[PDB]
Design a protein around this ligand. Structure first.
Ligand SMILES: *[C@@H]1O[C@H](CO)[C@@H](O[C@@H]2O[C@H](CO)[C@@H](O[C@@H]3O[C@H](CO[C@H]4O[C@H](CO[C@H]5O[C@H](CO)[C@@H](O)[C@H](O)[C@@H]5O[C@H]5O[C@H](CO)[C@@H](O)[C@H](O)[C@@H]5O)[C@@H](O)[C@H](O[C@H]5O[C@H](CO)[C@@H](O)[C@H](O)[C@@H]5O[C@H]5O[C@H](CO)[C@@H](O)[C@H](O)[C@@H]5O)[C@@H]4O)[C@@H](O)[C@H](O[C@H]4O[C@H](CO)[C@@H](O)[C@H](O)[C@@H]4O[C@H]4O[C@H](CO)[C@@H](O)[C@H](O)[C@@H]4O[C@H]4O[C@H](CO)[C@@H](O)[C@H](O[C@H]5O[C@H](CO)[C@@H](O)[C@H](O)[C@@H]5O)[C@@H]4O)[C@@H]3O)[C@H](O)[C@H]2NC(C)=O)[C@H](O)[C@H]1NC(C)=O
Ligand code: D0J
Ligand code: ZN
Ligand code: ZN
Lengths: 933, 929
């Protein structure tokens, strides 16, 4: 029999857009490769190779069939295995529109715990591949699973990518009720207060889930009702199945605007045998359309959006974001804003490093390795997956993520070493030319710990990957107490010695062995500190050889023994402020609700958070004032006021979190003032826009308060701040972190979490992270940064220090005779014009060599219009001065993901309820260029 | 990457022939159509449409891949839904050898409870489709699942089909141990005593199961280890999987002759997503052969057989059969020999009716409808499946089988009625011309129960589908006591009235309602009996209108009187005389003990009186016997019958005491049978069985009852130096001789537990409206003869039991009838019979002008001095009203020129139009008129 599968939309009937898809997690209960090859099916039945294999076969069978695929991490692995014949069939299918890429990034990223730089990076990775192989530009965003949604997702990873639409299943459960009643599930979304309608997108919140209506899942071996239309066989059931379809369509139509609705015909890792689904959809399209009451068609999210746009309809407006997300009364998904802190820091650290790595490789002439096996691009793009950096994957999967990141970090570390060796001489240098250290956090750095032979000096090369000149404190572990630091010009520099502490030494012994496999030499005796000064996008070289109020600067802090006050003499801000460590007790269920706190969901006990305190050292010196604090045996902190820093730097060391008492614990630091913050506080969106949050309040619906704490937590990637008439109090993070203001004048950060129960959303594991050789709970160490400012003065600290945290100096070490080194190496350099700096409001967020001679460049304006009277303004960058030592032959502006010419981008129109080489940049703008040299 | 999937065999290595297959039950836990379309997956995950869809896609991707498929019941349902492009693609795959048909019948039939005529019929239905669509002749028999194997499967449904091999997984568990030790899993099997090596076949019994070695089932969503050979991905495992493969190959090689072994790469309803299997098999062939220690290839059972035949090797010999089957000490699969007796009788009755239907349609010029939806050919073909007539499907599946058979029977009924209307007239006649009755067993025949109008008669047309003239008793239910029966010439015939009985009357009210939905009219008051005389392949017409020792003939029986119940049988003309008792007993079903939990069930048999009337008359003497409230019997000696007909009525089997019961009739004599007894092979050859003994291995006796039951489709007999005692059945039935001079039949079974082989249902058959246990009624036939004179009774009466007269009824004034209708007729020559040794088992109109004809010699060489000899049939006299234009002798399934059939050679350890037939021969022909 021939089925009429080629139906399009029809004007005066309800149209049911059948969109076949397979939701393929880039790691979750299995690793990425396990999901691809289909191993470990006892954990979860899932094989993405079967999906792509069988979908291509089913699409070949009938030209009217369609399927949408998203995650290029899987597609690219599959593609490299396919024959030339298959690759050509795929080209035909993509060219015909039968297989359409939706989203098209390397993964479907989390939107809470991700940084916009990483979101752009992996999306570009996917889009370049799709553009190269198929000459296709994705037009529909696909965020069907991420646990809430960010403003930047809407305007920057949606509209600015060229997406007309973005589709997602998860919104807050109270909000969803209101949107159904108001038919506002689909909105025109303006995530940017700066760009408004110039960066808007059609946003489609599904009625419930991203699966088919009940009885319309057709996966092989499932117990569905096949449409039996053969009169030679018993029990035909055509009329019943057609009515099943209509009934489901009418229910959805009752909550949707226009005569067009969409069915997401798929689910988690479905389509292992695609024909099982397409057989049923073939028959349903055929028989439903013969019936004639409604109209069914094979479609895609972009065909659907096109029909939604051509309709005569005005649409409700959506501003800001969809955080936080709850799927039930006691189930706010705000715990994963913090879950797996160590993995979050690892991602953030490697992202900064990878940024610098691509800079140095470009100058030294290195060749792109983006699509090579186990490259850091693959590893960091996988890491953005919505179960990966978010913390919501199984532990073995999480270990596999970190294994892949470490492999890519090792490749990047060799690129940096070889590149700096070439660029500092007076490119083929060996990677052994310099040594580098990434375990300063636990004091392990063999290059600076080892002894210096006579007539030689420890050479320290300092590379600065910001487009600003920078002054910073180098702090290295040493075993000699009479070293001299000389700058490039022979002058001895002022130094300070800081004594090794017992917390750090105790971390060193355990974790060096865990990470590196062998037990290290004795704990270093001292830290050596000195202030380095480095040109923008350049290096300085130093030579090292043998011969209660604190605050070396304007910012002062007062302690008992605990913090009591912060003030700035020069600016005249002064608040009494206390900081303490506490923890919420993790709920394990109660009489009214079995929901437990777990890796996704933060549900505190409803008991007040238990209190922890004594000073163990107060240190004073020209470069740093320090207060070492121990709150208990597993919570210790160091507060540091460094020379020339407009902030304190608070180093936390948390763990092992004790659960032998059977009580899960979610550890916070809480900063309590008297500022009249009036329930307001500000948190960033993926590290960019600041969103005004209001305690216990929602703009889009009248919140029913059910979790007065968990319901006020928001995801941080840059930081959190508060203000009143007289002060502005700001906190910056070093990794994705959850933050809230639970009381006026009060800010808190959740820093580490260890539960005894799983939260029943499918991961099947309490968040119980341990380190072994003889195991104990994982300890995390990191920094948060705090400062005080007059109103309208804090934004420039937040932006400037945020970028500095993102992009620290890179240190490279070797031992050579100083004079011999100065004879064969330039001790100072800059790749920009010697007297050029990027404006203070701009960051060079992408600089990378692509295939052939093409260079990808991105410049970001860091400020929103109303933040800083001087810097929230129009500025310019002279690219001739940015590349002083090279001549631009070609310049070309492209879309954010570099898959379209900027000038060719077109926008849909919506009726919304309530309505030379010099590059200019307005507030919040990001401009992307392809260059040739 | 490209994989070297084109490997062939290599001489200096062990070769693993990978044979992809999907074992598709034609009904079992789900019905055949549910299995096809994949509905009711909560019962069992199984969809045959997916198998054929995805296998054809997978074969298309790589020309070196192969797959074997067997069950045309499924293939044909799928074929008619396919597009022209798919059909064209399938023809290319079949022509290239990528898709090979094995077996090729409509189903994979049981070999215990099936009759050879039904086996030939459904195999022909499948093979004719295969030949017409693809010009292919299957060469491998595929019997991987049936529970034991019959001698007729080997020589007749194997060798004579043109099969070089037959493959099966199930043999007795004790036999299997010996055959592993002696490397005699594979044999040259000679199932026929008569034909020996002229009808031999390579018989391959698998080491254990028909699935793959452990860890090589690759069905989508199963937890197997994929072969990961991409160095860009973590956890490559090529070495591990290659070694897994080798270890399994070497283990099998140690119990197999030659350097070729076969892996059956599949299982029940597998290959829903075929690419999941072929991907792994692609990579295993590639990397195993790169390694080079063993050799792997895509293969088929026929390619494997060729390799085994080409080896320089001598093979052990197998004779007789593989019954009974047991897979454990207390697990003899001999219960299903009797399970679902009523379904078995239903199949047997419809097979004979379908034989007559195709004769009558041919004579009347009816067009063939063999491949039409719900045709009786489909229903009867399906019913041969190894869970169907065997009785081992779920109850709802069994109901569906009976519904398809009833649909087919209703169509056959109209053909018979329309054909007889045309042929007796002086085809376009309507089905309403005659009525017919199939419920005589419960006394329900409205056409004869109904009053006759004055100046009209009940016209009775009697058709005889045997090639022998036949006299037999017509016995119809009537409501008037003074009816007169005249033959066609006007002669009044001797009649006998027999009173209705209470047992039948209560069956009638309950079962007529069950079968037809409404209670019947008043029970009929009498049976009218009379003797009809009918030409072979012809008819006689009769007109009915208003006007303790027994034995009306030579055979006599003596009953105690004090207790009822047989005591003695003797024939006064031949001098045979044996004391003999007949009793009803039951075994208690085991529900397992603490040492073995095995219970009795649908597959496995695991065991733990007054005369109410004596009737005498010129046409029948009978003794009604009531053994208890749910067991009654009537023993009948009919005029001119050389045997007693013993009608049992059993049920409802009481089950409330908590114990299951398996009911037998046991005939006990003093004959010196010396542990020997004789049972038939699919209604054909008799095999000598010996109590508690096995020819091929030293039996360890664990079930001295259950291990001595054998499947009967014709009957069972014993003998000593003075007598032969013979028992014929009317349906597939289990029988045994548990002591010397003693013979027993299992007639009905009801268990309270399942026997744990997958059907998940106690054998607990019930009739519901209120429910009660099912009641079965049927006949077995007893007789006594002098040695070497019993065989001719068994063969002749067996064919008469198989092919009874067909009665057609109407009411008309006699003279107006005789004026418009030929009262008497035959389609053969007016004075020609087939020889007494011959039966016309097939006569059928195919498409175009082709007619299919089969003649069978009923006798084995040693059986009857007169009839066990070469004979001949005159085809011009068989077809008297037509002229034979063309004759062509073909193979048994009619897919080959008989003259062009080729046989492999094996070295075996220990070594006009007149049709001639030697003993046990079946010759098949295509004729054109
Ligand atoms: C501070 O700061 C810092 C920063 O800096 C932070 O962070 C950190 O960091 C660090 C660095 O620094 C890091 O570390 C790193 O890490 C990574 C990861 O780790 C993880 O993972 C792993 C893995 O896992 C997996 O596996 C296992 C086994 O099986 C298991 O168990 C698990 O579960 C998983 O599993 C999964 O997956 C898989 C796949 O993958 C599958 O198969 C399965 O089935 C599943 O599914 C692990 O292992 C680990 O663990 C460890 O550790 C821990 C801790 O962490 C502990 O606790 C434990 O216990 C352990 O430990 C133990 O052990 C060890 C070993 O044995 C020893 O040693 C010790 O001692 C103890 O006892 C974890 O979990 C990793 O990966 C890395 O590693 C690496 O590296 C090192 C040096 O560096 C060494 O030592 C090692 O060995 C390694 O090495 C390697 O790699 C490299 C790169 O990466 C290279 O270069 C080299 O060469 C090597 O390699 C090569 O070779 C080899 C031989 O040996 C091989 O294997 C390879 O291969 C591969 O790949 C390829 C390509 O190429 C392919 O083909 C194949 O397939 C393979 O695979 C190559 O070839 C390190 O360690 C960490 O992680 C971090 N952390 C976090 C948390 O994240 C921190 O945090 C801070 N701190 C504070 C603040 O406090
Ligand atoms: C509660 O205690 C434990 C327990 C378990 N079980 C049942 C185990 C059943 C195994 C079935 C395996 C698969 C094949 C079953 N075949 C499939 C063939 O295609 C079909 O034709 C055969 O009829 C049929 C039977 O052999 N019982 N009790
Ligand atoms: Zn997901
Ligand atoms: Zn079977």
């Amino acid at each position: 029999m021939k089925y009429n599968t080629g139906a399009g939309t029809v004007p005066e009937q309800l149209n049911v857009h059948l969109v076949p898809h397979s939701h393929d997690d880039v790691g979750w209960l299995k690793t990425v490769d396990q999901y691809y090859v289909g191993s470990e099916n006892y954990i979860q039945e899932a094989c993405v190779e079967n999906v792509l294999d069988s979908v291509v076969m089913s699409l070949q069978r009938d030209p009217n069939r369609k399927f949408v695929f998203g995650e290029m991490a899987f597609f690219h692995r599959w593609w490299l295995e396919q024959t030339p014949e298959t690759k050509e069939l795929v080209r035909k299918l993509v060219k015909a529109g039968q297989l359409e890429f939706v989203n098209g990034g390397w993964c479907m990223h989390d939107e809470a715990t991700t940084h916009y730089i990483d979101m752009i990076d992996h999306t570009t990775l996917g889009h370049r591949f799709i553009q190269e192989q198929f000459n296709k530009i994705p037009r529909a965003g696909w965020q069907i699973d991420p646990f809430g949604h960010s403003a930047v997702q809407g305007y920057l990873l949606g509209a600015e990518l060229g997406f007309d639409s973005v589709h997602f299943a998860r919104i807050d459960y109270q909000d969803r009720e209101k949107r159904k009643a108001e038919k506002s599930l689909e909105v025109v979304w303006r995530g940017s207060k700066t760009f408004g309608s110039s960066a808007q997108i059609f946003a489609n919140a599904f009625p419930g889930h991203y699966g088919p209506p009940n009885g319309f899942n057709f996966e092989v071996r499932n117990n569905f009702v096949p449409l039996q239309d053969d009169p030679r066989l018993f029990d035909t059931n055509v009329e019943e199945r057609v009515q099943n379809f209509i009934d489901a369509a009418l229910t959805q139509a009752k909550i949707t605007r226009t005569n067009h609705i969409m069915w997401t015909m798929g689910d988690d890792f479905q389509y292992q045998y695609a024909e099982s689904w397409f057989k049923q959809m073939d028959k349903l399209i055929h028989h439903v359309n013969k019936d004639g009451r409604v109209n069914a068609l094979y479609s895609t999210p972009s065909i659907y959006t096109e029909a939604k746009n051509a309709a005569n309809q005005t649409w409700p407006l959506k501003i800001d974001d969809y955080f936080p997300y709850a799927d039930g009364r006691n189930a706010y998904w705000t715990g994963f804003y913090t879950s797996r802190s160590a993995l979050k820091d690892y991602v953030r650290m490697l992202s900064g490093y990878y940024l610098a790595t691509r800079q140095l490789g470009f100058f030294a002439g290195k060749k792109s390795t983006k699509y090579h096996a186990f490259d850091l691009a693959d590893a960091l793009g996988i890491a953005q997956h919505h179960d990966a950096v978010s913390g919501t994957a199984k532990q073995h999967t999480t270990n596999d993520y970190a294994k892949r990141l470490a492999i890519g970090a090792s490749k990047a570390e060799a690129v940096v070493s070889s590149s700096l060796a070439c660029l500092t001489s007076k490119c083929s240098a060996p990677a052994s030319a310099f040594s580098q250290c990434h375990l300063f956090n636990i004091s392990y750095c063999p290059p600076t710990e080892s002894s210096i032979p006579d007539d030689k000096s420890l050479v320290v090369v300092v590379y600065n990957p910001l487009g600003w000149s920078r002054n910073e404190i180098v702090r290295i572990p040493v075993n000699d107490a009479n070293l001299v630091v000389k700058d490039s010009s022979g002058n001895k520099l002022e130094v300070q010695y800081v004594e090794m502490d017992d917390v750090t030494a105790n971390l060193r012994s355990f974790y060096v062995k865990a990470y590196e496999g062998e037990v290290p030499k004795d704990a270093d005796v001292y830290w050596s500190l000195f202030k380095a000064s480095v040109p923008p996008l350049g290096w300085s070289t130093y030579f090292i050889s043998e011969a209660l109020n604190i605050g070396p600067g304007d910012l002062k802090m007062s302690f008992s023994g605990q913090l009591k006050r912060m003030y700035n003499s020069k600016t005249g801000v002064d608040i009494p402020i206390q900081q303490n460590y506490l923890w919420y007790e993790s709920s394990e269920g109660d009489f009214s609700d079995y929901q437990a706190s777990g890796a996704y969901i933060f549900r505190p006990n409803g008991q007040p958070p238990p209190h922890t305190s004594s000073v163990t050292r107060v240190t004073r010196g020209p470069l740093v004032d320090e207060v070492h604090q121990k709150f208990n045996s597993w919570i210790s902190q160091v507060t540091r006021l460094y020379k020339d820093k407009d902030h304190a730097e608070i180093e936390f060391t948390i763990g092992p979190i004790p659960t032998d008492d059977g009580v899960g614990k979610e550890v916070i630091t809480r900063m309590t003032s008297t500022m009249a913050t009036n329930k307001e506080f500000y948190t960033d969106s993926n590290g960019r826009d600041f969103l005004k949050r209001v305690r216990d309040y929602r703009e889009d619906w009248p919140l029913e308060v059910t979790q007065p704490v968990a319901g006020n937590y928001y995801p941080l990637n840059l930081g959190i701040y508060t203000k009143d008439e007289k002060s502005e109090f700001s906190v910056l993070v070093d990794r994705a972190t959850g933050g809230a203001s639970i009381k006026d004048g009060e800010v808190e950060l959740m820093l580490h979490r260890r539960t005894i129960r799983d939260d029943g959303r499918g991961v099947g594991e309490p968040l119980d992270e341990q380190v072994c050789m003889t195991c104990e709970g994982l300890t995390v160490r990191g920094n948060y940064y705090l400062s005080i400012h007059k109103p309208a003065a804090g934004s420039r600290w937040r932006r400037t220090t945020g970028q500095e945290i993102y992009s620290p100096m890179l240190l490279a070490f070797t031992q050579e005779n100083m004079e011999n080194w100065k004879s064969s190496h330039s001790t100072k350099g800059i790749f920009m014009d010697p007297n050029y700096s990027l404006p203070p409001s701009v960051a060079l967020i992408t600089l990378e060599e692509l295939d052939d001679g093409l260079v990808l460049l991105r410049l970001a304006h860091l400020y929103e219009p109303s933040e800083d009277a001087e810097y929230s303004t129009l500025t310019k960058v002279e690219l001739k001065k940015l590349f002083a030592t090279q001549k631009i032959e070609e310049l070309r502006e492209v879309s954010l993901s570099a898959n379209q010419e900027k000038s060719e981008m077109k926008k849909m129109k919506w009726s919304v309820e309530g309505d030379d080489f010099v590059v200019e940049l307005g507030p919040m703008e990001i401009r992307t260029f392809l260059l040739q040299f």
